[model samples]
Target: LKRILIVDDDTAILDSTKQILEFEGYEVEIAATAGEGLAKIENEFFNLALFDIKLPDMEGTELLEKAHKLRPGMKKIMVTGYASLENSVFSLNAGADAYIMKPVNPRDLLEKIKEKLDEQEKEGHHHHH
Candidate 1:
């Protein structure tokens, strides 16, 4: 089974997103701040993570860089509503695997997730911890 971490300040989005991911067969966890998310990323292993651009404790881009450093070979999706262009680009540049906008449609998120995980499975690249 695949594991995913989701970090967003809004509880409403997190609520729906976690349920969606769970229904799709992935183990899902949610966090409100980059700090909490960071703790999980450090102790628990995840295949992918969804990040909001503006977190209460730290910026999404900053979290991306740090998280990837902590767990190399993990995948990430950068999600944002307002600061889309700036942070999206920064997210991609900082090693995020995909980007999505707010009020996220489940199909889009799932499809992108499948594509990224598929890419990770390509060649000898295992989604290894």
Candidate 2:
């Protein structure tokens, strides 16, 4: 099964998003802080990660940077309540595969997840040839 790690300070968002992803047949993990999330990243493998831009320990972009270095193939999506042109640009430049604004629409979130995973698979297949 495809695995996902979600790092968000909001319990409601974490639970609801995990439920949604799990219901869709994904294996999901949750972290309440940036440090916790990075620790999990170091200990396990995930196909993708959903990170809240504002975390207790650091900006989601910082985690994204670390994740990219730790697992270069992992897809990263930045979730933020404070959406702005600069934030989106910064997140993408910092290595986020996509950016999502809260309150996230379930449909959009699922679609984006699938898209990123699919793209990764395609790239992997190409490289194996």
Clashes of each: 0, 0
Off by over 4 Å in 2: none
lDDT of 2 by residue, 1-129 (tens): 999999999999999999999999999999999999999999999999999987889988788888899998999998889777877888878878988888899999999999999999998999899
Residue 48 deviation, candidate 1, in Å?
A: 0.2
Q: Top TM-score: which candidate number?
A: 2
Reference-based lDDT, each prediction: 0.87, 0.91
lDDT string for model 1 (1-129, tens) is 989999999989999999999999999999999999999999998989998978889898999999999987889998888665677678878999988877778899999998887887772254343
Backbone clashes in model 1, listed as residue pairs: none
- Superposed model 1: Cα runs more than 4 Å off: 123-129
- Candidate 2, after superposition: displacement of residue 58 in Å? 0.6
Model 2 lDDT, full chain set: 0.91
User: Model 2, 66: alpha-carbon shift in Å?
Assistant: 0.9
Cα TM-score of candidate 2: 0.96
